[PDB]
TrEMBL record, chains A, C:
The lineage of its organism: Viruses, Monodnaviria, Shotokuvirae, Cossaviricota, Quintoviricetes. Belongs to the parvoviridae capsid protein family. This is Capsid protein VP1. It is found in: Virion.
UniProtKB/TrEMBL annotation, chain B:
The gene is cap. This is Capsid protein VP1. It is found in: Virion. Belongs to the parvoviridae capsid protein family. The chain holds residues 532 to 635 of 738 of the full protein. It comes from the Viruses. The lineage of its organism: Viruses, Monodnaviria, Shotokuvirae, Cossaviricota, Quintoviricetes.
């Protein structure tokens, strides 16, 4: 209901964790689980690749269809670009429905 | 035992030969009848049924409301509308993301 | 300078004429060329087919490009369509330059 593709077997969940590395234990045995760990984090790169199938537009319509367009008029910032401070923004929602068909 | 009643727009209506376009008397039209499907299909004019409108308690007598329009429920069965010698053969199912029982 | 493709050997000129059909001549010989003809015209269908080669757009630009779009707002007539009286019109000039490149 929010949108997209319903899937019985969707892309799986990918779960990641830093393996705990404990600090030095007491040197005399204790049954209690070790609560003292070395503070750690991890970084890296993630790459994802999707292949999408397209359904081409066969329409025989004569007059030109509505398209998604960038505004021609001048502005302080480019839409879908970083600003002076360096942060990226998306100025508007872009839906997918522009070309037309007959019922 | 009621053949005099019919749903207002709820049945197909054919004209007799030579019937006009506008404001034609009942005598020139030919009404069809779907009564054959009253086995599985609710009657067009009457309600579907009644459901509870409230929670019951010793201080509150039960109330039961009428269901005039009912969408698909699991366990329903029904018949499609009949076809006629002078009626339409086919229709084009619209091209859409979804449909339900796409019979014209 | 008006536009398009300069061609040393352009598409040839296609010349068409109704062959003259003279009316009845005098029945006694005269050297003068015959000035009396049957009034005629001709009709038919002409078909032309051109194959165009396309140069695809390789651009790596991030933000969306300007496109040619039909106006979304309501109007009495559709652009590039016939009107009530049945005549076809082109409401505006449409140039070909929309996508962008780097120098």
């Amino acid at each position: 209901l929010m949108g997209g593709f319903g899937l019985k077997h969707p892309p799986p969940q990918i779960l990641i964790k830093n393996t705990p590395v404990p600090a030095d234990p007491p040197t005399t045995f204790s049954q209690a689980k070790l609560a003292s760990f070395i503070t750690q984090y991890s970084t890296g790169q993630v790459s994802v690749e999707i292949e999408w199938e397209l359904q081409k537009e066969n329409s025989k319509r004569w007059n030109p269809e509505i398209q998604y367009t960038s505004n021609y008029y001048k502005s302080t910032n480019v839409d879908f670009a970083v600003n002076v401070d360096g942060t990226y923004s998306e100025p508007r929602p872009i839906g997918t429905r522009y070309l037309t068909r007959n019922l | 035992d009621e053949e005099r009643f019919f749903p207002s727009s709820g049945v197909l209506m054919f004209g007799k030969q030579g019937a006009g376009k506008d404001n034609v008397d009942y005598s020139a039209v030919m009404l069809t009848s779907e009564e054959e499907i009253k086995t599985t299909n609710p009657v067009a004019t009457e309600q579907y049924g009644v459901v509870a409108d409230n929670l019951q308690q010793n201080s509150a007598q039960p109330i039961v409301g009428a269901v005039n329009s009912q969408g698909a429920l699991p366990g329903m069965v029904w018949q499609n509308r009949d076809v006629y010698l002078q009626g339409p053969i086919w229709a084009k199912i619209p091209h859409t993301d979804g449909n339900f029982h796409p019979s014209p």
